[PDB]
A paper describes a structure:
Surprisingly, methylation of the site of aminoacylation, i.e., the 2′-hydroxyl of the penultimate A, only partially inhibited the loop-closing reaction. To determine the structure of the resulting alternative product, we scaled up the reaction and purified the loop-closed [name] 2′-[name] RNA. In this structure, the glycine linker lies between the terminal 5′-phosphate (G1) and the 3′-terminal A22 ribose. However, we cannot resolve whether the aminoacyl group esterifies the 2′-OH or the 3′-OH or possibly a mixture of the two. Overall, the loop-closed 2′-[name]-modified overhang adopts a structure that is highly similar to that of the unmodified overhang sequence, except that the aminoacylated residue A22 now occupies the pocket previously occupied by the aminoacylated [name]. Conversely, the nonaminoacylated residue [name] protrudes from the folded structure into the solvent, as did the nonaminoacylated residue A22 of the original construct. The tertiary interactions stabilizing the closed-loop structure are the same in both structures, except for the backbone path flanking the aminoacylated residue.
Numbering used by the authors:
A (entry chain L): 1 to 215
B (entry chain H): 1 to 228
RNA sequence: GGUUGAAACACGACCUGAGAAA
């Protein structure tokens, strides 16, 4: 029966200057042998707090930690825009060491409408039998957005994928790509390709279009 | 010179199921003999999972149940390097593996104060494939938010990762390189885009520099408005 | 439980306390 670390909340969204707290409960006593880390996606975690309440040398003073029994709290007293990350607690009271499941911290800010761009497939790609059509939504907030593909005014389904950047470290926006994949034969059969974007920054949905082969 | 604490990892990459791999963690700025060294891994979309550790003075070793009997941690103090030898690899072992230094007790308790950069281990029977790179062409007729946009589409590559720069790194403002997406073919694709002044198209050159080390692919692609 | 030896075990020194497997 390994010690479990239960983190809360699963995610939070707070503005610059806000006080944020994250908690972690150990399933049994871990004394004060708890560390907190900050991790950017795909990067090494960084040590913030050790022995429950001690600030690691060099870490900014807005971070602090505290213990009450088996409940551990990480506090950020005044959130900064680079503080978006997943934060993890860890117990090293006994082997095996165990980690909490992470709390994702997002920087809340004002609404920003996306700028929208559509890209036809290149002639070079078509020669290999597949066509990729790309829609870009640039520098928007919040993250939620709908992208609808229309081919000759017919709504598309099941043939696109989306990817999103992490938040901008300066102004907290996202960008998003939507890629529509068609066979060359299907691409050549139709004329008008359109990307329709709905987002709370836009009063009305924005559609970008091109005509195949028409410059 | 200033002596910096550094952990430099190597040895990761693509390995067939049932195969073996040895990861290395070469340390500088401190003598590994006097620290506990740990391995921690992170599977795609999952959290941190502690894997193994080795103790100073004794060389005692410890393992997570998930790897016990298959993985071996060790340290060669004469090379200031720690190792994770991994046998009988399964798909569930696919992850970024990190080595970490447990800090000095009086200054950091048991916290892990320095970490390696991570190395990706991919357990799969699939073959390495280099990407194709296609232009995302811009236009002075296609402006939004006061800019034009252009980019490069990097497609059908395996395993991760690829990296993209623009104009050999001289162009960074407005660049967005999206996370890779796994296609139904089992190959990855991503795009990298940049917003630029519409007045600049035709006065300025935009080249995307694509790197896929697993295949030794280095590709530069000029992105220009089409003559139309 | 805490301090401390570059130190969770092994190899050492301590503090609190009836006892640090408390």
């Amino acid at each position: 029966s390994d010690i479990q670390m239960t983190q809360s909340p699963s995610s939070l969204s707070a503005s610059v200057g806000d006080r944020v707290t994250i908690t972690c409960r150990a399933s049994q006593s871990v004394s004060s042998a708890v560390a907190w880390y900050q991790q950017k996606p795909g990067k090494a975690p960084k040590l913030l707090i050790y022995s429950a309440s001690s600030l690691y040398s060099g870490v900014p003073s807005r971070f602090s930690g505290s213990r009450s029994g088996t409940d551990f709290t990480l506090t950020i007293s005044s959130l900064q825009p680079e503080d978006f990350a997943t934060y993890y607690c860890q117990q090293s009271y006994s082997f095996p060491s165990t980690f909490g499941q992470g709390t994702k911290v997002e920087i809340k800010r004002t609404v920003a409408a996306p700028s929208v761009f559509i890209f036809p497939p290149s002639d070079e790609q078509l020669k290999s039998g597949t066509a990729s059509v790309v829609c870009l939504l640039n520098n928007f907030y919040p993250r939620e957005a709908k992208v609808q593909w229309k081919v000759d005014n017919a709504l598309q389904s099941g043939n696109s994928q989306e990817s999103v950047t992490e938040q901008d470290s300066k102004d907290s926006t996202y960008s998003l790509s939507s890629t529509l994949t068609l066979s060359k034969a299907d691409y050549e059969k139709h004329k008008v390709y359109a990307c329709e974007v709905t987002h709370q920054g836009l009063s009305s949905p924005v559609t970008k279009s091109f005509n195949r082969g028409e410059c | 010179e200033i002596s910096e604490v550094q952990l430099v990892e190597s040895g990761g990459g693509l390995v067939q199921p049932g195969g073996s791999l040895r990861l290395s963690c070469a340390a500088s700025g401190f003598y590994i003999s006097y620290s506990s060294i740990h391995w921690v891994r992170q599977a795609p979309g999952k959290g941190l999972e502690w894997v193994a550790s080795i103790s100073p003075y004794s060389g005692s070793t410890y393992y997570a149940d998930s790897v016990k009997g298959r993985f071996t941690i060790s340290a060669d103090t004469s090379k200031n390097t720690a190792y994770l030898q991994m046998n009988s690899l399964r798909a569930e072992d696919t992850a970024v593996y990190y080595c970490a230094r447990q800090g000095y007790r009086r200054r950091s308790g048991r916290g892990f104060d320095y970490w390696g950069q991570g190395t990706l281990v991919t357990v799969s029977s699939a073959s390495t494939k280099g990407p194709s790179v296609f232009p995302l062409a811009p236009s002075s007729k296609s402006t939004s938010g006061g800019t034009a946009a252009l980019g490069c589409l990097v497609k059908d590559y395996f395993p991760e990762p690829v990296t993209v720069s623009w104009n050999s790194g001289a162009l960074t403002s407005g660049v967005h390189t999206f996370p890779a997406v796994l296609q139904s073919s089992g190959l990855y694709s991503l795009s990298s885009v940049v917003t630029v002044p519409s007045s600049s198209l035709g006065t300025q050159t935009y080249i995307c520099n694509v790197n896929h080390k697993p295949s030794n692919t280095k590709v530069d692609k000029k992105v220009e408005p089409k003559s139309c």
